[PDB]
Amino acid sequence: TTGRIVAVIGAVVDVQFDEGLPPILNALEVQGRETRLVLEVAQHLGESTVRTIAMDGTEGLVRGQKVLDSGAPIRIPVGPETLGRIMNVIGEPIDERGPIKTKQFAAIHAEAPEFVEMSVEQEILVTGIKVVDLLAPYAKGGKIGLFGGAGVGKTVLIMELINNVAKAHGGYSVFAGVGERTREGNDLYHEMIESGVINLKDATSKVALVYGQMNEPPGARARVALTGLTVAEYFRDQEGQDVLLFIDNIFRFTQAGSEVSALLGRIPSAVGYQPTLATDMGTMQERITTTKKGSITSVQAIYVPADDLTDPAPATTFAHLDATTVLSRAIAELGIYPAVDPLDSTSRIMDPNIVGSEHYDVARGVQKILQDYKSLQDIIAILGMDELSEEDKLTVSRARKIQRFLSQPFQVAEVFTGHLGKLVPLKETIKGFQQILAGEYDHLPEQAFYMVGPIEEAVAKADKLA
Amino acid sequence: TTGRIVAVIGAVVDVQFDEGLPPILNALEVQGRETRLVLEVAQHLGESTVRTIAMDGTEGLVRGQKVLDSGAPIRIPVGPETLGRIMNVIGEPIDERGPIKTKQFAAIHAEAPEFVEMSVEQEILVTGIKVVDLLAPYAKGGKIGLFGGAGVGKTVLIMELINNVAKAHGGYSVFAGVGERTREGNDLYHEMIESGVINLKDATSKVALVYGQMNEPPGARARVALTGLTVAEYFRDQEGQDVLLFIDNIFRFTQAGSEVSALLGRIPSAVGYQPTLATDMGTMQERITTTKKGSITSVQAIYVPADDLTDPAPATTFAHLDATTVLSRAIAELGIYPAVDPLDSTSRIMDPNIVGSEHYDVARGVQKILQDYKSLQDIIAILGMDELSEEDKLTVSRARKIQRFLSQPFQVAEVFTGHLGKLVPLKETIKGFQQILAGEYDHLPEQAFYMVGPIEEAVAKADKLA
Amino acid sequence: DPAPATTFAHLDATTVLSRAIAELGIYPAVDPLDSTSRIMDPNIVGSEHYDVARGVQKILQDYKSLQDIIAILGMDELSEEDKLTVSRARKIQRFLSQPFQVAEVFTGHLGKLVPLKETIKGFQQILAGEYDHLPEQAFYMVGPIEEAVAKADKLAE
Amino acid sequence: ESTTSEQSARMTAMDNASKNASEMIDKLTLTFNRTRQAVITKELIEIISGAAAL
Amino acid sequence: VDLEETGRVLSIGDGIARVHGLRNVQAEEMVEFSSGLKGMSLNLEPDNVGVVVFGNDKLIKEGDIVKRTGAIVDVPVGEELLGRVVDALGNAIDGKGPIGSKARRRVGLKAPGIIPRISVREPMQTGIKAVDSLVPIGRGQRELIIGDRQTGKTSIAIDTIINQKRFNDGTDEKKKLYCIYVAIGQKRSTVAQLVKRLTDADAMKYTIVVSATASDAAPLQYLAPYSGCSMGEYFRDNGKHALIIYDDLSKQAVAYRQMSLLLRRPPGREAYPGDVFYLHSRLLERAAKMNDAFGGGSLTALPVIETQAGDVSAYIPTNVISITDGQIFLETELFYKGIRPAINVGLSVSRVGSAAQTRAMKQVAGTMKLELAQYREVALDAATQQLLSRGVRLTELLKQGQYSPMAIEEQVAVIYAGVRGYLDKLEPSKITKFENAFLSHVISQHQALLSKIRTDGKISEESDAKLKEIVTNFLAGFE
Amino acid sequence: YFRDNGKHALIIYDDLSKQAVAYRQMSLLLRRPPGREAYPGDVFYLHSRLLERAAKMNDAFGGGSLTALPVIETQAGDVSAYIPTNVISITDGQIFLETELFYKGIRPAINVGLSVSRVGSAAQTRAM
Amino acid sequence: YFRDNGKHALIIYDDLSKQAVAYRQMSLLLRRPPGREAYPGDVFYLHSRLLERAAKMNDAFGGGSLTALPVIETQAGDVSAYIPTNVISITDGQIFLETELFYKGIRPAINVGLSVSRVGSAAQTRAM
Numbered sequence A, B: 001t002t003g004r005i006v007a008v009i010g011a012v013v014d015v016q017f018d019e020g021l022p023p024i025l026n027a028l029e030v031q032g033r034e035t036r037l038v039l040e041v042a043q044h045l046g047e048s049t050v051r052t053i054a055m056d057g058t059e060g061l062v063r064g065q066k067v068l069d070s071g072a073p074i075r076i077p078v079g080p081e082t083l084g085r086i087m088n089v090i091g092e093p094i095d096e097r098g099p100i101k102t103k104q105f106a107a108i109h110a111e112a113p114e115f116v117e118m119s120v121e122q123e124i125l126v127t128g129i130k131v132v133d134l135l136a137p138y139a140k141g142g143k144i145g146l147f148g149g150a151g152v153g154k155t156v157l158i159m160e161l162i163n164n165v166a167k168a169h170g171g172y173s174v175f176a177g178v179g180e181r182t183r184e185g186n187d188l189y190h191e192m193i194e195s196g197v198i199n200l201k202d203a204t205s206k207v208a209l210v211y212g213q214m215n216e217p218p219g220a221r222a223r224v225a226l227t228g229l230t231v232a233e234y235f236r237d238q239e240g241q242d243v244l245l246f247i248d249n250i251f252r253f254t255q256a257g258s259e260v261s262a263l264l265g266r267i268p269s270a271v272g273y274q275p276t277l278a279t280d281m282g283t284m285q286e287r288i289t290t291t292k293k294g295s296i297t298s299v300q301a302i303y304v305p306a307d308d309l310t311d312p313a314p315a316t317t318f319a320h321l322d323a324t325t326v327l328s329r330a331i332a333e334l335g336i337y338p339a340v341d342p343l344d345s346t347s348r349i350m351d352p353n354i355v356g357s358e359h360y361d362v363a364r365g366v367q368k369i370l371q372d373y374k375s376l377q378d379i380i381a382i383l384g385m386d387e388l389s390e391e392d393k394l395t396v397s398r399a400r401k402i403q404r405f406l407s408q409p410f411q412v413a414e415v416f417t418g419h420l421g422k423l424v425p426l427k428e429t430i431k432g433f434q435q436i437l438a439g440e441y442d443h444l445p446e447q448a449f450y451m452v453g454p455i456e457e458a459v460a461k462a463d464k465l466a
Numbered sequence C: 001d002p003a004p005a006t007t008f009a010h011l012d013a014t015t016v017l018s019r020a021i022a023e024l025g026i027y028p029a030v031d032p033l034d035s036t037s038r039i040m041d042p043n044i045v046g047s048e049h050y051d052v053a054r055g056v057q058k059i060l061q062d063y064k065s066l067q068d069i070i071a072i073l074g075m076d077e078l079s080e081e082d083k084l085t086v087s088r089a090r091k092i093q094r095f096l097s098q099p100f101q102v103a104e105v106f107t108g109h110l111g112k113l114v115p116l117k118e119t120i121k122g123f124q125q126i127l128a129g130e131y132d133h134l135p136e137q138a139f140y141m142v143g144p145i146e147e148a149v150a151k152a153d154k155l156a157e
Numbered sequence D: 001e002s003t004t005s006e007q008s009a010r011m012t013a014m015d016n017a018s019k020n021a022s023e024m025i026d027k028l029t030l031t032f033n034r035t036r037q038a039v040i041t042k043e044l045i046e047i048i049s050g051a052a053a054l
Numbered sequence E: 001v002d003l004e005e006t007g008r009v010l011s012i013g014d015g016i017a018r019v020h021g022l023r024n025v026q027a028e029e030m031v032e033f034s035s036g037l038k039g040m041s042l043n044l045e046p047d048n049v050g051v052v053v054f055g056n057d058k059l060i061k062e063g064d065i066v067k068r069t070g071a072i073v074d075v076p077v078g079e080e081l082l083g084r085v086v087d088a089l090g091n092a093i094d095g096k097g098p099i100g101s102k103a104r105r106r107v108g109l110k111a112p113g114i115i116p117r118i119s120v121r122e123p124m125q126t127g128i129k130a131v132d133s134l135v136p137i138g139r140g141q142r143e144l145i146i147g148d149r150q151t152g153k154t155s156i157a158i159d160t161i162i163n164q165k166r167f168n169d170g171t172d173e174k175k176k177l178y179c180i181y182v183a184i185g186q187k188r189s190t191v192a193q194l195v196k197r198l199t200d201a202d203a204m205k206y207t208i209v210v211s212a213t214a215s216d217a218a219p220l221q222y223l224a225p226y227s228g229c230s231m232g233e234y235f236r237d238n239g240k241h242a243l244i245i246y247d248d249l250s251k252q253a254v255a256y257r258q259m260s261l262l263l264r265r266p267p268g269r270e271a272y273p274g275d276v277f278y279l280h281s282r283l284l285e286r287a288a289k290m291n292d293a294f295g296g297g298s299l300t301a302l303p304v305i306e307t308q309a310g311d312v313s314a315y316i317p318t319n320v321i322s323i324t325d326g327q328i329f330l331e332t333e334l335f336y337k338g339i340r341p342a343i344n345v346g347l348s349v350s351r352v353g354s355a356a357q358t359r360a361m362k363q364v365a366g367t368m369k370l371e372l373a374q375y376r377e378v379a380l381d382a383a384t385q386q387l388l389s390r391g392v393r394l395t396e397l398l399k400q401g402q403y404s405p406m407a408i409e410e411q412v413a414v415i416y417a418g419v420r421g422y423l424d425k426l427e428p429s430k431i432t433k434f435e436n437a438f439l440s441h442v443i444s445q446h447q448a449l450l451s452k453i454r455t456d457g458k459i460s461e462e463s464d465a466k467l468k469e470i471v472t473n474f475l476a477g478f479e
Numbered sequence F, G: 001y002f003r004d005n006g007k008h009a010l011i012i013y014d015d016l017s018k019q020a021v022a023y024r025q026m027s028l029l030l031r032r033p034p035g036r037e038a039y040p041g042d043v044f045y046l047h048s049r050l051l052e053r054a055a056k057m058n059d060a061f062g063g064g065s066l067t068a069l070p071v072i073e074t075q076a077g078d079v080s081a082y083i084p085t086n087v088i089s090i091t092d093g094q095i096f097l098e099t100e101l102f103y104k105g106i107r108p109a110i111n112v113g114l115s116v117s118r119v120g121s122a123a124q125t126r127a128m
């Protein structure tokens, strides 16, 4: 049935319906427009009038302009035909390759899996990336904060994560560009094409892209996360996969929701965030999890406003994270790729009761030896390296040798370098550093461990050095 | 005559009367209830409707429900048989010992004693607490205020004062538990039975109890002070006697005030508070006073929200007091109890012509060395002890010995301190700080001054340290 | 503050006065690291005026960032060229002060008007080092550089 | 013997001065943001109260 | 037709349903939406009812029918709720079929007044050495658990719950303790894991779990603790003992702020409403110890509060410290260094627990408190080095893993070792090792004495002298 | 009255902080929208018109005068806050007192740098 | 016009603080809801739809471009203020200037450690 626009105030549009009213969250199709104008029902004002938030510009709308209730929330195309495609928030293709032809559509608003639908187990999601698995491992269905910002291997890491999860776990990936910069969305898409993870020729693609560009209205940027989230929910729910979901970036999901809140006339809360800060976050996050059928794991890029970890935005966010990958510029400048800081990057599942007594002890030794290597670098500057005790001479060698073994070549960059990448199995990771700590490779040259896969390829690199 | 409820929202109920509109402050009796539900008329909304505040829960109230004007404001028992009893905000017995059968009743709302009714006499009240009696001594018939953040020692200090001042005072006492703990009421009540200042079978009771704790709704907490107060007025006026009044905690009255002000539909003032904060408190505080007709010595605990003494509640409270005792979290966390700030507590009898030049000189000396030391603490926090001139080191050593000797074990706090409680005569307090200022104990180590009574005990603890 | 902040742009020259500076007795309490002029440019006031001015701000700003630092870390640790820029800036600050004709009731001092060239020359000379031997307080609340020198003798006894 | 003890002690004093300073950096950083958050919130409640009173 | 028992929805969307009609509704009465959702009458206005929605108000439309239920908001209550996971309304969420519940209790009942109470006096044994000895708790007390995220807060609650099995499998009925874990704001997966943990420990058979998670609507999150609390009161008022965990109240206050700002309540300090204190105060007042004339029952409340950067001075932290009877404070710095449970002793208090600590613990505990008080003060002469020697070692004794809570007699034997100097000669990195070797030795060989200590609630002069032998014999043979 | 009849008077307002609190109360209950720090937008004017009425009249108008000493309470030594600066911006000077000075022994606790008189030596005898 | 017809333009917006202020005026007077700093919820949108229109077009579309140098005034170097937050977030890099560097004789007063360009080496000749 069909209602009439009665009020247009910026990106807020009020529509009046003569008969049956569209429930909250329903998607409204505005008529007489060259492109699609979706209005999400936000409120019921009384007197048969709904308050809506526009998903695109409202320039041109006239009082009385017909509006068709679609009868559902925003429904977007889902299934394998989305892989390699870029869609927008309402499910349209924006890569100009034509319709996304799927046999299913799905609503972007879904309630979280019920208490019973939850996996009571805590599993590691093996990434194949040594630093991560050993020290800050991903929980299957957990959330991970990604710190770093620019020029730190952020795109390469993402692209390798996609690749490694397709290979080792047979799951696909989704990328949700929340406040994606048009320019950077062009670059990332091509970077993905060139690394293989998107393939435009056949159907071997591993990521699906959903872009909520910065020049779109508040309601659009607030919802893109959900759009991508549902694309991911298909793979977990219909196909039984363990899926990767990238959210870039989670701070702009908050802000977008803050702006929506502000347009709806609501009272701001502490520091000018929406009062529904925690719930807005909660209803999106809880969908990310392990069900009995499959799991969605999410890698979320964080911006910390004012460098304040106690700002409501990062505070609220941290409540949902199970691990942090910290990408540091310092480490990159030392030629370690991935630029992962092994001391700053933590995991909630770094607990012997979850990952195993053994996996625990090795990580804590690797952490310890690197901490103790930081303690000596001043005395290294003061007394030189040859005024260390014989036990201390070893800690340095080993530490420096552990530092490099944490580096690793990526498949996603085989094109740029000529070096074959490595997905390293968890047990070989555990073993490599296990054996290093024990001094089973002290005699080997420092440079044998650098940019290598498993520990066998370090002995192989040492034997080749004339 | 008879009125009907037309609106309910938490504590605030609107009532429409067809004839006979009850004046502001009149108490109204809601019909159809199992326990007595009083409404106080707050405003005349117009249209034969009044806005009222409930003295108890409003669950169960229906629109249409009947209300009777009592013809007067809340009236409560007053006189000799309030002694030994616990009553609520509306004078009902709450100790399960039956009717309270007084000859007199009083309205909880009265106007404040007139300007001609003021007394001008200032006489020191020695508490036995070193910090207080020295720097900011209390006065018989005066207004004492105990400021403190959450958990810093407000209630211990008041209980200690009740022990140290009340027992040896041939008059009556009123304790008004206002918005505090119920189990503390239960503690206070049995403690008094155990000590016999309340007798359950005699007529020898010396304290009257009035309680409206943090389980009560806001109206009740907003008025309990008036009840408690009112009982104190009777004893001051209709006997001429020496009355002691302890309130814990008066802040709760303003907070309670804050909770109904939103509902009463006022435009809020600073930090969300009621824009009537100042006058509300003034009309209530001005009643808590010594008059030509009889003396009231009032000791009120004053809670500081968020440790902010610039918050409207406490900030506005300062000007109602004759002596302040400002407690400091930071000081309590250093182990100094009572956690008195020696440079923020003041007293209006700190004057050489009232307390004598000797007392005045030592006090100013104690506070001088403490301020000079406080000025030196930033140079200390970066560069520490060593970088100070020989002179500064002496002001430091002496101040630190002075801070420690300001502390005292309370008989009421023996479980937390591990020391038998001490009470120091005023002379002994003076001579102790005097001697520490003349340098007589420069050779003693600080630790000797911590948690002792008279100076002689510090000496004994020094020798005991060998 | 919205009000003063919105005003700056309507201005060709800004004289900003500071309480911190007034508190020290430096009047007029003009903050030399926050006062500006469109015409403070060599093509306009000439390279001599511009260089001096820029210098005065340089030594003053250098001093400002040494202040909080040597206040705790001690004066003696400084390089002998650094602790000269300390002595010179502290003099230039004082030489920025000046008795006003309309403030005789506030100062006790006689009002003094300094011609442009004499101001440039006076400061040029302090930056040069021509008065490192003169006491700080000699430059305080005087007109032209002469009166600082004269004031130096009256302070010698 | 004098300079051995001097540079020994100075090393220690400056080590402690630096560590104290570092601890003070954090404490002020925490205060800043607690103030930073309150100012913002305060400015906002003033605006809201102003619009709501109309 | 009937606007006395019924209304229709006028407007919806701010989490508040404006409802025309319903002329005979009570304040705070549950109403029932045509879509099955429950609601609460909050605003009884001349021409509408303001109804707080106990679920997703996406499901409510203009024109929907609302019916009175006649009942002030209440929840199912009784023993049949044990071993169950329920949402905030009481409806079962563990899919084990209906709760066979026989009574119901109001969620907003005012806490017991002054007379029916008596000061706490029965130990509430957490099983955590550091807590039970240094920050001891009695049944009826409110003890706050406070700290930054990820500092071990929930852990305190969980081992406590798990500890009670020792009594809950006895026939001593007064010695028992029924638990309720209220999850406000948590991840659902976190809760699901938790009951799995409890089930695994066979603790779930005496626990009620009330869940109001990150994706439940705000009103639900706010209601959960009260729903939890009535369930507890069932035991309090019936001659039984209940422990309740509000995990956590920071999140619940956030829930409430969202409701108040949407209701346009004037924002105060940190945009929190005037009544944010009252929200917690009334709740925790409901934890209580009842005297023998009202059953002798009790409800112990362990609320959780989450600090931002160890700042105990912020609005909500201080409100709750101003309510409860002391606090366990958990430091990020202590937790980091692996000191676990990460208890700051200095800043932790139990205002009322000393009275409900066994004599047996008190005999070793008072001197431990003392020697640890001396050691904090001095973190190369004879005396002040020994307090360092003793101090580090007592600090190692307070360390403890998870899911292994300790019987009281086991705790004291361990602390006995410490406070009687037997640990002084050993190295700090071996105290943990000595503790486990020693504890399991005495459990397998000297049962008679451990039992006697549990039974006597004391260390007798024989027991002490006997425990002097056992330690010397073991320490000389510890390698 | 004294002022306009060739006499001299001295008036103390103890204190105008509390007056402001009372006008803020009155203004908000009259439904006048709050402004900075919840006070009304004309809190300056509240004190400006009061104090401009302290004045020195010339001989033709009688030679009488009225001298004012408003009192303002600060919060934690902040002479620079909104309200304090408002009043400073009305009066012909200020005497700023501080606790630190007070307890250091400097009583009267006048902070010299921050205090002023806008009339200066014209208000002194030649001797002083 | 240049971007689309094969050419290159440079646009300087001077400044955007002031633009936002003009929009804040209209919104508030239109009685739209005020947020942080009384800016409306569409202030980020305002600036983000302007600055996205700067772009490098491909050959298929003429190969032209429009480069934007937006200007933002901070207050006491508060880069975390609402509007600065918006444009920093929006842009591809920032040239930060400081007053202390200015008077240090460092002109132009560019903070070299803080300023960034995420385009980076990609827009330099091999020489530079």
Ligand SMILES: Nc1ncnc2c1ncn2[C@@H]1O[C@H](COP(=O)(O)OP(=O)(O)NP(=O)(O)O)[C@@H](O)[C@H]1O
Pocket: A348, A349, A351, E148, E149, E150, E151, E152, E153, E154, E155, E156, E340, E341, E400, E401, E402
């Ligand atoms: N006694 C202990 N010994 C060793 N590890 C522990 C102990 N207690 C807790 N942990 C670990 O520390 C982590 C955090 O503990 P938790 O009980 O979740 O604290 P919390 O502050 O309540 N967490 P959150 O509510 O998410 O901020 C968990 O992963 C536990 O494995």
Ligand SMILES: Nc1ncnc2c1ncn2[C@@H]1O[C@H](COP(=O)(O)OP(=O)(O)NP(=O)(O)O)[C@@H](O)[C@H]1O
Pocket: B148, B149, B150, B151, B152, B153, B154, B155, B156, B157, B303, B337, B338, B339, B410, B413, B416, B417, E321, E322, E323, E349, E350, E351
């Ligand atoms: N004089 C004292 N000596 C030793 N310990 C004290 C003293 N005063 C307070 N404490 C400690 O602090 C705790 C709280 O004391 P209390 O008197 O309740 O302070 P309060 O300010 O009333 N708390 P609250 O009402 O919640 O703000 C006590 O249980 C003691 O452990």
Ligand SMILES: Oc1cc(O)cc(/C=C/c2ccc(O)c(O)c2)c1
Pocket: A270, B269, B270, B271, B272, B306, D037, D038, D041, D042, D043, D045, D046, E268, E269, E270, E271, F036, F037, F038
């Ligand atoms: O510690 C805090 C935190 C906070 O979030 C706010 C405040 C104060 C806010 C305020 C807001 C509006 C006013 O008009 C006012 O006087 C004060 C103090």
Ligand SMILES: [Mg+2]
Pocket: B154, B155, B156, B180, B248
């Ligand atoms: Mg108290």
Ligand SMILES: [Mg+2]
Pocket: E153, E154, E155
């Ligand atoms: Mg927890």
